[PDB]
Amino acid sequence: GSMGVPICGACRRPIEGRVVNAMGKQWHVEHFVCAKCEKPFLGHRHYERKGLAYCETHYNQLFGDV
């Protein structure tokens, strides 16, 4: 009877549908958002920076590998 459920690092709640593995954790596909505007990537692409998510523009606005 070992555990068997991911937990959204956003609300620390047991996820149960589509999980997002980021920050070396798991996030509700609905709570995984940019770390600057909070825009969830339900079905979009996200960007990571310093260990934090960022939209395509905020990530870049924040850095953009440049």
């Binding site: 937990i7 609300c11 620390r12 709640r13």
Partner: protein, 71 residues
């Protein structure tokens, strides 16, 4: 006067905190999160249902009750 079912939390590890504002608790402790300031570290003012209070890494416990309950 402050223990409504909002964010109850079950410990995941028997942590040890013995200071003025530190929370020492054995695993399996229902802690009533009194407050969750940022301050800087990330600790929370959580009372222990065992009837005690102290700061504790909000990552050493999980949350069961929640406010935003949509559907």
């Amino acid at each position: 006067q402050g223990s409504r079912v909002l964010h109850v939390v079950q410990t995941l590890y028997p942590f040890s905190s013995v200071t003025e504002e530190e929370l020492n608790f054995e695993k399996g402790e229902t802690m009533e999160v009194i407050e969750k300031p940022e301050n800087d570290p990330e600790w929370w003012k959580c009372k222990n249902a065992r009837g005690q209070v102290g700061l504790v890494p909000k990552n050493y416990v999980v949350v069961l009750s929640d406010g935003p309950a949509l559907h």
